[PDB]
Amino acid sequence: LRHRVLPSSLPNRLFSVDNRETTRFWPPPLQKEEDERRGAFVESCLQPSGKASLLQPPQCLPRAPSHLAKLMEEEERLRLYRHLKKEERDAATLNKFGIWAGEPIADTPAAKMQPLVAR
Amino acid sequence: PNTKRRIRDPFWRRSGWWRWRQQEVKAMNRSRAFRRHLFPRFTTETVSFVDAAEAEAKRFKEIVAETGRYPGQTVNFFVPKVEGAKLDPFAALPSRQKRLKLRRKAVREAEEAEKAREDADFVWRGKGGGRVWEERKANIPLGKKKLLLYCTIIKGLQITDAIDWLSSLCLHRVNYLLNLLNASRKKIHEQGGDISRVYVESYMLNIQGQIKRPQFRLRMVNLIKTWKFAVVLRFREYPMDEYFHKLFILKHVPRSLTTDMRLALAGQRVGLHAVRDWYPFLDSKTRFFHRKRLKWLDRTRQFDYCLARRVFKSKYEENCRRRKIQVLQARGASDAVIEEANL
Amino acid sequence: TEPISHMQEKPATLRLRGLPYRTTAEDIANFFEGYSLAGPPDEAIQLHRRMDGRPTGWASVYFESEQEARRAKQDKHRSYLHGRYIEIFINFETGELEWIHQPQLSENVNRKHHGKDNR
Amino acid sequence: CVYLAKLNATGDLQDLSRFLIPQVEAYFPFQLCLLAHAFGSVRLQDKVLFAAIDEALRPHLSELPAAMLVKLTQGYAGALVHNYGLLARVSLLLQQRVSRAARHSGPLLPTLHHLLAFGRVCADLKYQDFGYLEMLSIQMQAAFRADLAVSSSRETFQRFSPFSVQELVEIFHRLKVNDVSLLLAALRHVQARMHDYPPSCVASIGFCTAQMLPCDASTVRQVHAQMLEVLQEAVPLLDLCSLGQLAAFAKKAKPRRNRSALRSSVFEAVEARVLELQGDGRTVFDVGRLLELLSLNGRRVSEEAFHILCRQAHRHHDLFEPQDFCRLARALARVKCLQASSLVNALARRTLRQEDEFSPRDFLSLLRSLTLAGPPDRVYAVPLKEKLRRKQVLHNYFPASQSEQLLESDLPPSSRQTPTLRKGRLLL
Amino acid sequence: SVASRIHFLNSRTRFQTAVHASDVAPPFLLLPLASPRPLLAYHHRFRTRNRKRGSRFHPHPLPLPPPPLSPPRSDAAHLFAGKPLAASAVSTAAGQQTLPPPLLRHLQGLFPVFRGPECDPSCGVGPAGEAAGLALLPPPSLVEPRHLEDLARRALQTRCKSDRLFWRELAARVEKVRDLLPIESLVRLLTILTLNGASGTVRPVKQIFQAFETQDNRTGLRLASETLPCVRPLPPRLLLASTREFLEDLKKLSPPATAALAATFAWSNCASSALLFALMERWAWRTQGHLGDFTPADFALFVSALGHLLSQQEATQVKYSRQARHLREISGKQIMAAFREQKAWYFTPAFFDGCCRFMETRAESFSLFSFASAARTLVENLDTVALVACPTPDSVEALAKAISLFVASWDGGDKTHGRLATRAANLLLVARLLRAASQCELYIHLHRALRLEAETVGACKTLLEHISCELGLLHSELEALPLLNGFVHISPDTVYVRNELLAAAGESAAAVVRLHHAKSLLLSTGARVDRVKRWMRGQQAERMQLEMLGELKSEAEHLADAIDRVLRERGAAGLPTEQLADLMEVFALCVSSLQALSSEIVRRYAALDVNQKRRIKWATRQMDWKDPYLNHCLGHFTAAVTRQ
RNA sequence: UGGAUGCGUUAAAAAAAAAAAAAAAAAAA
RNA sequence: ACAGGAUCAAAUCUUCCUUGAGCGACUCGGCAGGCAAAAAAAAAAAAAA
RNA sequence: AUGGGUAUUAAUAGAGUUUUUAUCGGCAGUAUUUACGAGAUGUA
Fold first, then answer.
1. Cα E598–E599–E601 angle (5° rounding)?
2. Which of A14, B13, B192, D392 has the least C-beta neighbours within 10 A?
3. In what order do the strands lie in the sheet with B132-140?
């Protein structure tokens, strides 16, 4: 390139469920749950323990170790990609607005994503 | 009830309903209402409705006032009405009901004539027009204050909408108004008017009196009254062009019609094509978004007002004609009878 | 358009009420054994469901002719299916617009001097 | 949006895409083509908008005029969106329209200008369509033959122009497609009617042809010799870009006689002309290559010309490639072995920022040249060594021929990251 | 990544190469495996927030008919003007009002505006411009899943700018009811959508997989830009969503359904690694699924799709493995420690052997298209240079036997001469069959020679004889195009058919060269293998000889004469880029066609591989060819070859 | 398993506070 | 918006200038929600099918 | 490399997919709302 082309920042500046560049990891609790369930599924299917985990309805996934190794490599690459992109976006947000999302400090209904009610 | 329902006040508002605010807000509302209209960008003529009977009465009275004589009089003079007179000086002129009958006759004649006129599809006519009926019911035991409520409810509504309105109220004395409306609808249908495009245009209340009864109390005798009133309703059959401009362009659709459409779709009494067929009239959201689509198509000059009007009119007329033909066929009528019925 | 739901013109129909939860289209077809439907049972018989799929207890059955529909109604009205007698209704109009002939509404409702009823 | 793009309101144009997106399917195809061109003109990438535009134009592409197709493809090229799915379809459509061939809309049938515009778009997007280039070569050879056949001097250049010839040659050079017959035909036409060829066109054609073809060929050598004669004749009219291209071409050529004297005189003339372009702060050219050519084979650059060129090199930094960085560093190191400390510092800072853009060998040679041209400030020297070290580990690169942590005292004093307090004022 | 994007944008040596417009294929996409998405469920919860306040019957937007190329007249008086218009224009002018067939008949009787060809009186115009047969079909959004298959079949039977709305609606509805459709119905729906999307398709010349046989102006070829292969028939999201359903209900697919599924995935050029591996493991000879239950056509389709997908899957896996370095995290301590220190087979054998057994057992009940595609796919590379890492030679011997039996039956079988397009396609298929035979022979011989280190000809003749004559006949019968060596007429169908012919020629030349190597292969035991390796890798070696071919020497000479005859008149442009070295080597064996080949190599130098460049260099050196431009390209470009 | 009240308990600090109902360069809606 | 501009040209991470106060601030633009039903001391509590 | 056919990492025009509780009874029918431009000086 001789004249650099500038990518549009609107994907970063548009906050809605229809903009993935911004809603991909939102809310953080459900992002963590998604990552945990993906890991559990990978461990219970691509690393079988000889028993049916029953986490989901059965699938006819490959069982040959040669195929399982490549599937595991693919999943590891996907995990690394997601982690790195989340880290980079968090760093950019911190450097721009000083906004930072952390882990919950107390056991409260809001941290559980539930409404506070008389019960 | 909800106990938090917002009940409206026409004269005061929290947001500020002083007279200057009313002026500004109603200017905004008028602008929006006018901009809601889509108008054809090409027409051949601008025909306007006229009432020959009313014009002739006006000229007759103007001549009487200007010359002091009936039109054609040469010797005698006009004689105004006096106490005890049994002769009507304007007896030669038609009555109001006669003028209405002549209006219906003229509307029928013009409707027949328009079917053989070239360029009839590119003519603008406007709001007024069509046939008019005036129906009166007397001896209603209700007062002005309640009749005003019940008539303000129904003024401007389609006849079936008004009947549904008044039937939902569960009021014993509204049975008089319901009887009047039912009888008027039956009469217009028998005379050949299209019930689908008959609206209540105006009402008039005429007192007749009040029957008084004694009411004996501790220190005085009172008189309690039972009212006697008459109601006159003005029904109008909208011409097809006005019906199209109202329902299709301005999205002012009878709720009775929309409810019938929704019931048909829910009960699956029509095909899946009916959803897109009735999209322009079905629900508030569909009506709003179709109005937006029409506005965009008009502003890009892809929408054609005259072609759309012709399509709507043809579809309506063909549906009615199919109804007539198939109800005749359900009787086992002969082909000759069916053919002659169309002449 | 082969499907009845797709046809612009629907065959003669009947509406059935009183159906238990167990009722199936095959059960309705057996109930109407000996009567000519507008097509195979999967199209001629349509049980009515809510948004969650729960049976409403109402069914629509399509026949090849109005004569057959009326014969079926005459023969099967108040006949039993799964221990409950079923009620059958015509479910199509005449085109005559009989609703225009409304009855005269009472102008002498003397509520306080008449017997009690749930009209 | 078109007006905003023309006015350079890039931010406003970018914001308006939010409301543009849900309306692309409703606009007219020529409106969409103009939208794409407007976005490309400011070099603003909006991939969602461009994808939506492509989906909307899918059913209308075949009926679009050639000018509108060129506008759409030029917008894509300017945005550097590599939609080869669109490029292939446009190439097929243009070929079909030309085969059939053989005021608000514009003609469906294209012209040589439209073909050359699409070819330049393909060069920008690195789309090497050999079939399309074969078609273009055949058409251009026929056009050259007809132009030579023309006799009355009024119908010459009727279908094309010297600028069109230059654009064709540049297209083929950039795409690295060696159409020997086409290049020879272009050189023959240039020889036949060189008196009508602008000197800038001659310089560009000579540059591209010498870079592409061997100069040992008899015809190529003769034509290049005549072109060099005319260019040395017309040096006083040339701008900085044409001067740099002429300097490169005069050295890449292989003349029959006075090979060294020709290059020496060309360089002397270029030096004399550069001083006359001191204030030309608008033209874009290869300062690094010009400096390298001037400082080569032991030749020493004139002090004034070197100062002017290094002063002007600051404008081009935002346009530099890794190879441009390496070449400029090489030129500065050679000239020292004069030194432009500010230019070296800017180069070091920019390469530290853009470290990822460099291959192992490129980065190693660039750092060597940076050190040899007068070492940059430690603030850049130290982290650059760390980056080179990391790159060598990652790429397992260790050539046969082959520090500390930063200290607060090494930070620039213009900033105030040290706790020291100084007498003076901060004039806002 | 941004770094890799910048690398590509900076590179002056990397290009997207295409000899002809139809070369460009959609980028290959690998579809990751699925897992529960509570986050996406949350987003859906938000999206459905206000359904109670909306319409219960048409919540979605009304489709917008595509607009015309030019704006309409300012007064917008189409009915008055009276000129008939397109169906979409009619709908927009009517404000998207439905026009059933009887209404259209009436309105056509009255006014000519409704008398356009797109307005069929027996169909209607539809509420959004749906013309012809589609006008009678209800919108897919409202159709129940149990009727979608019949709806799609009726829609496809119709085979116009408003058809895309219907087909996009169908795709969306299928994606929504993927989990309600029966699996077989889902496969058939995908096939129907692919057929509609790619109707009027032309295969890339250099690509092997093809869904259907080519048999079913001057030629029978029509090149439509709107349906080039680069247009992906299906959206990747639909395939991604359907992968989970297929994996859950894979055991209920019949052999034809599995073949159709693989065909659709290969047609769209999207791969799911898990699904492909599961399909490979499900089927084996005599794995509760028999490869013999397949018919020959379905078997060939399945094998071709699987190979087409797996090759690119392996390539992407390798490239991503190379990329993973920069995603990995390294520390400065490890970096310093580093200097302290300083101071390709993707078929499982159980499946390859089964496929070879199937071919050997049923070679006699194949067609040219099916057998050639299956054999060429099963052969592919065969690790011929490097030579589980490799398959057992027994399977390759069975494949060679299958080729021989098929050739024996097919020679007796009679041929049909149709359009030049079909004839060229068949010629290319025969050339690819010859290539597969040559690769089988070379692999078997290399295994035997390696064994020695540690310690069919008739079918080839028949194929060569057929090719050498059919090539000349097609060249004579095909119109003449201009030569690279007021526009000039160059028809695209003619160009494409010429490319087909030249691809067949290149495949034949490659097969001949590989046969030469296999025959040369039989101290000396290792010397022969080293010689073969040097010839294939482009290192210095003694000039090859025709005598090695033996019984095929005359056939090779006749093929070379035919190729010279073609290249002399048609020119060199249009040759496949993957066989220029093979053609040069054949010319070297047999010693204006040579000049044409050299000029084309010079023109395409930037797109050629380093191995091809080395082979061409040494072939020219042995031939004593002295092209002054090929010399310049060989000696002044591609440092990777100049320095060695 | 709970509700209300004081005959029960707590506070008596903030007022530029607690809080609110009308973002206003919009000068003829 | 690091969006536009200047310069012998900026530590990674802009040396400055412009952006009247980058619309009061942050968002949305198929946003927004008056009535019914069902609930309901102020409030809160049901995704769609 | 008397130097840029030149070395490194294009996911590239596509980073795309509906969670949990729950034996059984009940609500979810409607209306308003965004082009208050002169599309247009129509694509040169």
1. 65
2. B192
3. B132-140, B221-237, B198-216
Partners of residue A9 in chain D, C-beta under 8 Å:
14
> Is E327–A63 a contact, with Cβ atoms under 8 angstroms apart?
no
Residue of B47, B66, B165, B186 lying closest to B117 (CA atoms): B47
E39:A41 CB<8 A: no
Residue at E573: amino acid letter: A
Bridge partners of residue C89, in order along the sequence:
C15
3+ Cβ–Cβ pairs closer than 8 Å linking B and C:
yes
Method: cryo-EM
The structure tokens listed for B245 are 């401009």
D193 phi/psi in degrees, rounded to 5: -125, 45
Residue E402, C-beta contacts closer than 8 angstroms, at least 6 positions apart: E356, E359, E360, E363, E371, E375
Count the helices and strands in chain E (H runs, E runs). Answer: 26, 3
Instruction: Name residues 35-94 of chain B within 8 A of E (Cβ).
Output: 41-42
Separation of alpha carbons E416 and E627, rounded Å: 43
Statement: the CB of D417 is under 7 Å from strand H: no
How far is CA C90 from each of CA B84, B282, C14, C77, rounded to the nearest angstrom? 65, 26, 5, 11
Contact B276 E106 (CB under 8 A): no
Resolution (Å units): 2.2
Torsion of CA E572, E573, E576, E577, to 10 degrees: 90
Contact E417, E423 (CB under 8 A): yes
Distance from C-alpha of E67 to C-alpha of D32, rounded to nearest angstrom? 12
Token code pair at residue E330: 């390294």
CB pairs A-D closer than 8 Å: 34
Q: Any bridge partners for residue C30, and if so which?
A: none
- Window 32-71 of E: residues touching A by CB (8 A cutoff) are 32-33, 35-39, 42-43, 46-47
Cβ atoms of residues E375 and E391 within 8 Å: no
Give the nearest nucleotide to D312, CA to C1': G8
Length of chain C (residues): 119
Q: Residues 215-274, chain D: which have Cβ under 7 A from strand H?
A: 248, 251-252
Place of tokens 């109009």: C93
E137 has a chain C CB within 8 A of its CB: yes
CA dist E575 and E573 (Å) reads 6
Amino acid identity for residue D349 in this structure: R
Hey, is B37 helix, strand or coil?
coil
Query: Which distant-in-sequence residues (6+ apart) come within 8 Å of B297 by Cβ?
Result: B303, E92, E95
Q: Phi and psi (nearest 5°) for E302? A: -60, -50
- The token pair at D206 is 């000579």
DSSP E17: E
Chains interfacing with B (3 or more CB pairs < 8 Å): C, E
Q: For residue B198, what are the β-bridge partners?
A: B237
- Give residue for tokens 């328009």: B114
Token couple for E171: 């795709």
Cβ neighbours of residue B247 closer than 8 Å, sequence gap 6 or more: B253, B281
Place of tokens 């209540």: B200
Nucleotides of F under 7 A from a protein CB: 21-22, 29
Give the Cα separation of B105 and B101 in Å (integer): 6
Q: What pairs with residue B207 in β-bridges?
A: B229
Q: Inter-chain contact A5–D44, Cβ cutoff 8 Å?
A: yes
Tally the residues of chain E: 644
The answer to whether residues C58 and C19 touch, using CB atoms and an 8 Å cutoff, is yes
Please identify residues in chain B, positions 5-24, with a C-beta within 7 angstroms of any atom of strand F. Answer: 14-16, 23-24
**Which residues fall within 8 angstroms of residue E566, CB to CB, at 6 or more apart?**
E471, E472, E475, E501, E502, E505, E593
Strands C45-49 and C13-17: unpaired
